[PDB]
Amino acid sequence: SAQVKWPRYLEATLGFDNHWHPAAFDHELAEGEFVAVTMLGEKVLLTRAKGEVKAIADGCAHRGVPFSKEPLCFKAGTVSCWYHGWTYDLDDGRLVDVLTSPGSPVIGKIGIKVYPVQVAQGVVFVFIGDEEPHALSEDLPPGFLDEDTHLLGIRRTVQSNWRLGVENGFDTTHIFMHRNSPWVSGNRLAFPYGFVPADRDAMQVYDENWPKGVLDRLSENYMPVFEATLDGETVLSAELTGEEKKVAAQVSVWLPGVLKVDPFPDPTLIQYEFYVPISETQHEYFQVLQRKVEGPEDVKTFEVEFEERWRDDALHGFNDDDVWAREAQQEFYGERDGWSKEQLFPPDMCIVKWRTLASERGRGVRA
Amino acid sequence: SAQVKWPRYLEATLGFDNHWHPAAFDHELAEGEFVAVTMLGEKVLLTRAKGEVKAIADGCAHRGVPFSKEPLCFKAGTVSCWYHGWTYDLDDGRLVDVLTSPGSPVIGKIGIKVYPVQVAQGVVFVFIGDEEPHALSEDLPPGFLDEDTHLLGIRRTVQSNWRLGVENGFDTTHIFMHRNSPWVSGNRLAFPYGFVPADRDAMQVYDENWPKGVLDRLSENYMPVFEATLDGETVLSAELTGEEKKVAAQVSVWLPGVLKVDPFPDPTLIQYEFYVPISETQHEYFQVLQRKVEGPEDVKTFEVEFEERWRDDALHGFNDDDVWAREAQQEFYGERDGWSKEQLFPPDMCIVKWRTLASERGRGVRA
Amino acid sequence: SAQVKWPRYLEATLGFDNHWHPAAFDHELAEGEFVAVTMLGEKVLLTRAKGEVKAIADGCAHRGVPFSKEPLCFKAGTVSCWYHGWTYDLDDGRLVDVLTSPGSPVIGKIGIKVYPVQVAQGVVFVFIGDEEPHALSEDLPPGFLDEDTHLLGIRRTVQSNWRLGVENGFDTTHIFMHRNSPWVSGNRLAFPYGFVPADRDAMQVYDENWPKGVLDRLSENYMPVFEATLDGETVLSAELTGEEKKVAAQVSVWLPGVLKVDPFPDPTLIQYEFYVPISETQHEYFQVLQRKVEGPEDVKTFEVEFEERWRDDALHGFNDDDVWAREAQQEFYGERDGWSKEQLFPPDMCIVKWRTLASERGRGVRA
Ligand code: FES
Ligand code: FES
Ligand code: FES
Ligand SMILES: [Cl-]
Ligand SMILES: [Cl-]
Ligand SMILES: [Cl-]
Ligand SMILES: [Cl-]
Ligand SMILES: [Cl-]
Ligand SMILES: [Cl-]
Ligand SMILES: [Cl-]
Ligand SMILES: [Cl-]
Numbered sequence A, B, C: 001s002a003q004v005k006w007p008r009y010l011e012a013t014l015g016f017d018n019h020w021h022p023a024a025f026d027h028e029l030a031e032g033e034f035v036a037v038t039m040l041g042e043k044v045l046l047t048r049a050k051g052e053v054k055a056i057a058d059g060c061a062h063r064g065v066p067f068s069k070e071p072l073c074f075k076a077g078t079v080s081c082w083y084h085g086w087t088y089d090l091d092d093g094r095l096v097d098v099l100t101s102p103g104s105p106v107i108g109k110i111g112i113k114v115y116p117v118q119v120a121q122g123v124v125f126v127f128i129g130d131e132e133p134h135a136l137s138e139d140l141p142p143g144f145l146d147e148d149t150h151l152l153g154i155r156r157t158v159q160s161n162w163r164l165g166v167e168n169g170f171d172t173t174h175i176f177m178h179r180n181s182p183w184v185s186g187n188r189l190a191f192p193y194g195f196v197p198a199d200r201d202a203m204q205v206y207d208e209n210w211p212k213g214v215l216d217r218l219s220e221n222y223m224p225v226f227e228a229t230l231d232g233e234t235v236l237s238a239e240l241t242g243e244e245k246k247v248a249a250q251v252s253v254w255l256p257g258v259l260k261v262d263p264f265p266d267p268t269l270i271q272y273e274f275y276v277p278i279s280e281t282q283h284e285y286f287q288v289l290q291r292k293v294e295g296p297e298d299v300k301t302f303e304v305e306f307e308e309r310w311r312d313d314a315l316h317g318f319n320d321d322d323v324w325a326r327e328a329q330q331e332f333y334g335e336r337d338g339w340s341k342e343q344l345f346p347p348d349m350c351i352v353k354w355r356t357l358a359s360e361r362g363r364g365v366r367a
């Protein structure tokens, strides 16, 4: 059954820890500003001190209140609790002072957790887990860190377990539900109702070193369905006329659960998606677009396109439906043991391979 | 105690299954239209295909999503899931196609549940349970199916266990709370504060074949109370003056839990009530009025009176208070084990007879 | 650990019963008026009958509905249920009549709980518990019942366990969070960021007879902190310029959990606080100000300044922040076993003494 081929995947209700996970976008943090996030059940407080983004547990060691209720900073590099003034050093999380009791004997005897942080491609990543952090590149799809590119994205909260997000991203026939998105005609896309594996090389598992993932060779080893038929009659057909754009030549997912749609939502872009667990029933959905650039002008041109088109016409215009689609599955999988009652079909094998690889390679399980 | 005289009634938190239950009104469904309902914990999707109302489980066999999120029909007699296009035959619930993968090998190897449906007197009834359906008439009070009558009603959701609804309907002294309803003077009713059993033939149990139920002979074996006294002083008195109408000559309840008030809310009408479980804490309250008719003209006259008077002046004007009355009992009975702590009095014996009959005859228990 | 030092305090999630607790203010009840309250998990109905405030269980013995849904009284000294008319004697809670069934055999054979009530200093106190009530003075801080004073207050609901309320009131360094309240400059207060115990006599435990409690001698055995320093630099300093008022010379808490701030929020006043449990996660916060008076004129002057100044400028302007401060602790202590994970420091010892005294002297534990 399910609990037999991918047990650790089913156990990772709260995600795979001992992996890097995005928390926010670098531009969300100005010097001295605070941003509260919840990752894999942990409340984290982010801030920028002396130009560097720091991550510390969003909970005071005294009476456990979150600093985010009223975040205070009286000296860059520290955070002070709004309740009794306990002050912590962001570099090591140690209690270095108590504003309400100078010289208190608890100073230097207490500390809270701080997390390793690395900002890459404008994204703030945080290492969650007890192990010492490994290279960030091991937890990202290949190409994400390309130096000759620029990235722009957004994040939002989705009311479903993170796994439903990943499986909604790495699903080659769910695209049927996007057939009426204004982005399809909006960007003159030749968009099929689904992709069906045409041979045994349709899916490739990368399990040699890191990163590890599953790749769907949509453009070479799949058959796209542009027509829907019911009992011998064509009841639906995609629009294939004139000059149309080709997207999604390949789609892949990589541990700890990051999607890569290449190219998408336009031939000149690549779309990455993360589904970071917030709680057992919620996740933070990140959408990041990657554009190849040759200099500052291309960067500026991309930023403008993102603001005027890509973001709202695609990240919302195309993907908004994916949000309620995920949430529509929450009860079944989250409450009714859908993991053992689902009935899959051929195209879902890529998802099965992902669950198997994830169950075998996820560095740490958080239930 | 309770768990000893009517144990199966106490166990039937989610209702008695293997019985017919109303789901909606026939006029709520036009050809191709969809109506989602939840009955005894089961989500059901109703539609009209080729003129006939069909009932199918509102949950896809693939990833369990409900079709009601975005119901699709590309061929009358089928329903297609909005997610990956799995299409089902409404007659048998079998998967007959997959819009995103024509000829997929799962076709014909999967199916979901469909329910027997029977429309009578403008009401859509659905058979819930594993057993094969028996005659509809066995689950309705006598007279409901009278051919020389026409029926009109409404349904609404109530936040209480269904048993609290049934017992609020089949309660001869709770009417005290309706004394100030504008319908009392609105329809010149001689309406008492309560009916107290006057002899041993006040209540009669019908437990021979079907339908089965309990009847209160209010007009001949009960004493109506038109005056409320306290410490020897008359503190309240009903208005008995001029030409007033007499209603509620008899009130009865029949398995699986259907009320019959004869006559009510007017001498020319009979009122039926159903309290179909939605969940363990909610039920769908149906109010159906029956009028004897001699032809099309009488039907039209009834439909007009219903729209202009009966529905809002009585079904709401009189009964609305019954809704919060039921919900006011939810915590006690639903959370504080009120079933074993309640303290009944003589008039409640008709309810005791009903719980006993239901516990012994309910065809199926759904906990 | 905590479970070993103050076990009964940790068990009293729903408060200490067999103690008097405030329910409302006397002026909230006019003759024949009703006020519903929930104390230590019990729903209570208050009313004034023949000039006297009465307290009866807000739940009918018949089908458990609360009278508060629609409180009825047809004879001063009784309460009648809105559902079937069961009527109870407020003096002994016995069923003395049934409006819907005169002479019903259940009359005199049924009864509900009534509570001892005592009004003092404009406050309605109710005795919760199974024991016979003891003197009210045993559950109040010394000075509360002073005959040459007048009291005025307000109450509100707070979303946190009651113990978090008490410990927030009896905390000498949490005042840091109040530094920016408009009441500080509003009443020209010389207000420190915290009070730190300066010697061994800083806290005194009164455990000889009743009332019992812990007293902090702030003005004589504590060191007030008017500056906040971080890594050697003054980052915050209170305003100490000329003619300012001195308050909080002493603060104390007494069983079952009543605070006394002397003087506060002004030198001419004393502030009392109660934190009566509503449920396991909620409490009713009472704030009562005491002013010494010499006659009806002083009473009038106090009532006027309470309305024009004390209430909104202090009870709200100063204390409102204490509400979310308490609630910010609810998850940690209420759901994440904060009682054993908290890490206290020297000033918290007064709270530790209070927990110990309460665990040893609370008359009754309600979990
Ligand atoms: S809870 Fe943070 S200093 Fe007290
Ligand atoms: S969930 Fe219905 S077709 Fe996939
Ligand atoms: S529930 Fe109060 S009289 Fe029936
Ligand atoms: Cl978040
Ligand atoms: Cl369509
Ligand atoms: Cl593990
Ligand atoms: Cl009245
Ligand atoms: Cl059974
Ligand atoms: Cl309250
Ligand atoms: Cl400040
Ligand atoms: Cl005890």
Ligand SMILES: [Fe+2]
Pocket (backbone or CB within 6 Å): A168, A169, A174, A175, A178, A319, A322
């Ligand atoms: Fe999608």
Ligand SMILES: [Fe+2]
Pocket (backbone or CB within 6 Å): B168, B169, B174, B175, B178, B319, B322
């Ligand atoms: Fe009623």
Ligand SMILES: [Fe+2]
Pocket (backbone or CB within 6 Å): C168, C169, C174, C175, C178, C319, C322
């Ligand atoms: Fe405070």
